[PDB]
DNA sequence: TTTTTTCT
DNA sequence: AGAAATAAA
């Protein structure tokens, strides 16, 4: 139930969800490799970018992130929304609703562009404003997957390039979207939002932290390499989500 | 069917 | 509100 799985969660801590977000976490990874081949305010720019069309992909999310990161690595990219005109329309990962994503892109150019290096200091700092102002740029409810997903990748972009690090608030509730409600209804008749921030307060573990941990354990990666203890809770967890 | 969104 | 937007079998 919510109170082993919060007590488990809160052993692994935000210093286990940080282990295996800067270790095993593949979106990670492709970011750290496309922030070497690319100025860090465009990269901040095209995560967020990039965030708001991962939608209806046509490929698995570590697959398409690399797509991402491969291709713009070494490229001058001036115009966002240009830049996904090409890109987009011959990719293999992401060939679904390309006007429609091509169209959330070009509404949120103007917020992209407010994103000097300084801002994004101050977005790192206030990841709250940030989940609200994207969702206002686009006129939709801050609680929808890709603006919440966008905040995720924002922290991971932002943490690489600042060299700092800031949890995730704890007001922003994990994405909702297909795969968390069938983990969710493995483990309880709760509705997930209510149910993951009960787990996300008890554990002191922000929700999108526990996101984190949640899809590469369920996925099959591996442990093995964390320290014993954190090693011993997350198979604790797996026990319980897998 | 399984793998989010706009327009309003 | 809820029909429609696209790729794969
Ligand atoms: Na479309
Ligand atoms: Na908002």
Redesign the pocket.
């Known amino acids: 139930g919510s109170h082993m799985i919060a007590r488990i969660i809160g052993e692994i801590g935000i210093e286990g969800a940080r282990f295996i977000e800067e270790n095993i976490d593949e979106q990670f990874k492709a970011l750290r490799y496309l922030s070497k081949g690319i100025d860090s305010e465009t990269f901040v720019k095209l995560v967020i970018a990039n965030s708001?069309v991962?939608?209806?992909?046509?490929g698995?999310g570590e697959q398409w992130w690399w797509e991402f990161a491969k291709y713009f690595y070494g490229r001058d990219v001036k115009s966002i929304y240009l830049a996904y005109k090409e890109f987009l329309?011959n990719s293999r990962f992401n060939?679904?609703?390309?006007?429609?994503?091509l169209?959330?892109i070009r509404?949120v150019e103007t917020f992209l562009s407010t994103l000097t290096e300084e801002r994004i200091e101050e977005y790192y700092g206030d990841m709250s404003s940030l989940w609200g102002s994207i969702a206002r740029a686009?006129?939709?409810?801050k609680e929808?997957?890709?603006?919440?997903?966008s905040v995720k990748m924002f922290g991971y972009a932002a943490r690489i390039v600042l060299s700092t690090f800031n949890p995730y608030p704890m007001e922003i509730p994990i994405?909702?979207?297909?795969?968390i409600v069938?983990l969710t209804k493995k483990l309880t008749n709760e509705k997930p939002r209510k149910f993951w921030m009960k787990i996300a307060r008890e554990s002191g573990v922000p929700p999108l932290h526990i996101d984190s941990i949640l899809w590469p354990l369920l996925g099959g990666a591996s442990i093995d390499s964390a320290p014993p203890e954190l090693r011993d809770k997350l198979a604790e967890l797996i026990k319980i989500i897998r």
């Open positions: 708001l991962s939608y209806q992909l046509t698995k329309p060939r679904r609703l390309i006007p429609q994503k169209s959330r509404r686009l006129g939709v409810d929808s997957k890709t603006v919440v997903f994405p909702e979207d297909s795969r069938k």
